[PDB]
Design a protein around this nucleic acid. Structure first.
Lengths: 40, 49, 102
DNA sequence: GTCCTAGGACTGCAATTTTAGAGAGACGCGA
DNA sequence: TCGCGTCTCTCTAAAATTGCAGTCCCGCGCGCCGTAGGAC
RNA sequence: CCGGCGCGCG
């Protein structure tokens, strides 16, 4: 759990949001798990 | 496909919900009236809303 | 935010997008709209439909890299084994959008 | 006797378990 | 002198079961039984 | 004055 807490502490949330949005757009611009990854 | 900007989503949702409410009340009232139970439409319309 | 530019926004500033990229995006979104209204609203029909969508065995391995030289013999083999070290328009316009036209 | 003493019924749903789908690097056979 | 279906994997998109999570009237009365274990 | 098990009443 120490490694998990270290990973959580140094997270950059804005970078997370931007990467998630860009990956969502990449997935969309291309059918079950192609959608389930989007919902994640 | 017929209507584009929100008149597609707005009118589609309005038509679906208006039809759903009519049938939801009818089915519930049909079940109770078959058992002789008398409940006003207001009480069911409060739940369906 | 580490970036002082993001001060003021709620979830940081919008990401950097070049004017060249923004124009390309606006070109793509316009044509995804034109393609959408085509299916909803005969030899001319297929040629415009294909046009809109187009505005988006070891020699097969060469497409994964830049194909330096190669061609004669054993060069393809040596390169594949050493690459692991780095590891109608006049008719389209006849349709019309009506967004914002109540 | 004892005084401390350490296996339903149904619905909803994401998680495995395939099934398949193409697909490719090295290749024994072969032209 | 390469070229050719292709042997043997190869990695992932798309369903197909499948193991949890959750829930399942209300309000009363009475009785019994816990509280266990081991070298003294 | 805490929870389980069993039996009941409306």
């Amino acid at each position: 759990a120490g490694a998990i807490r270290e990973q959580l502490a140094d997270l950059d949330l804005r970078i997370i949001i931007e990467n998630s949005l860009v990956e969502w757009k990449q997935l969309g611009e291309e059918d079950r798990k192609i959608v389930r990854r989007k919902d994640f | 496909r017929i209507l584009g900007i929100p008149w597609g989503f707005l009118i589609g949702a309005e038509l679906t919900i208006v039809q759903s409410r009519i049938s939801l009340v009818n089915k519930i009232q049909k079940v109770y009236r078959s058992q002789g139970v008398q409940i006003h439409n207001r009480h069911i319309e409060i739940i369906v809303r | 935010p580490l970036d002082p530019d993001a001060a003021g926004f709620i979830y940081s500033n919008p990401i950097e997008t070049s004017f060249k990229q923004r124009c390309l995006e606006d070109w793509k979104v316009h044509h995804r709209k034109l393609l959408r209204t085509l299916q909803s609203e005969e030899s001319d029909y297929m040629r415009v439909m294909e046009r809109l969508r187009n505005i988006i065995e070891l020699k097969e391995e060469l497409e994964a890299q830049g194909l330096p030289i190669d061609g004669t013999r054993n060069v393809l083999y040596q390169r594949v084994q050493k690459a692991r070290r780095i590891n109608v328009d006049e008719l389209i316009c006849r349709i019309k959008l009506h967004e914002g036209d109540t």
